Design a binder for this molecule. Sequence first.
Ligand SMILES: [Ca+2]
Length: 411
Amino acid sequence: QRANIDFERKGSLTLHKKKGAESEKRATGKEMDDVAGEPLNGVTFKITKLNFDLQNGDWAKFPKTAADAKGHETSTTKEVETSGNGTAVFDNLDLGIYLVEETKAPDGIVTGAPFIVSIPMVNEASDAWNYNVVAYPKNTETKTEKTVKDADQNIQDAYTYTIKADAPTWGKDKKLTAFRFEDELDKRLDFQKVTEVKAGDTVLGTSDYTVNDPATDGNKLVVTLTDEGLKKVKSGDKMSLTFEVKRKEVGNTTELKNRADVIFNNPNTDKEVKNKTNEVVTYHGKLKVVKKDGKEAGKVLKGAEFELYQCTSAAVLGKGPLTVDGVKKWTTGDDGTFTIDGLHVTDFEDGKEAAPATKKFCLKETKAPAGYALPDPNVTEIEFTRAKISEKDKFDEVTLVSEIKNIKQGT
Ligand SMILES: [Ca+2]
């Protein structure tokens, strides 16, 4: 039998796309059953026939890497997306040298580097020519998540944001050359400090990263890893950033949203990868108290003193007197009112619906205006929920108003 190449034959390329760690094992070009990772559907591959002649050209001069292929591209191309078991088949292929590139991939996928394939090929000199080439390209799934720890933290109380992100994987020629966290903070927020930067289970020191100054940087936070920092990062490590903030005021809406970004190099293609987190929400509103004379019609009262408590009901006071923005006692003004700017809603915390919505606020009247008796009970429980603060009474959307009555002493 002849061992020659049959140039009246047509070849094929079969890609078995995998989600996982790179193959530092040079592939046979034949079937391998290397299901180390999970099959990845949705990745598109583009093959490009190169000018090189297998029939009459010098094979010693043929490209062996994606870099050597540059400048030898032809108009003959084909695009296929992975479908069943993360498989893309390129059929009725003219014999020749092809460049294989990833054109599209799903969200969070860090693609592998482009590669070169010969149709036909041999793994070993003793093998028969192989016209049906099989390759196992690799990819890495990198997820980015944002959480908020803001339970019982009112206006000017420090609360934290935490950004979690999967670092990419890198081969032994390849490396992680850049890695940063970006977060555009709402104008109502004041950055406090970065509390923790973690690479896997390794808590980094302040020499391993840099912090910009959000106040003079349009309220945008940037936390970049230095050269020292990067050295501590291992392939595919779970990166973490916890930083502290204070909400200055309630503002125009009860809700305050946060979303962040992670930017790193693709170790294989060296091109920048931006990854965006989910959006998290913190809710605060204002509490307005109006002191009224119970028996004397349409009359407000100056000089009524109050304290604020956490409570399950008016008969059962919890934490308090509470300090909200350096004040732990409020007195009604010349208009018979005061406004606490502001408090954490009782029905939504740490980024989710409160379970159970048992928390309430309690106003304790500590002193009645001159010539007025101290009401009994002197405690008013408040259902400070998003829905109740949202109600309007033109007689607003971010303020909940509480009417409290006092009666003149003696009679
Ligand atoms: Ca309201």
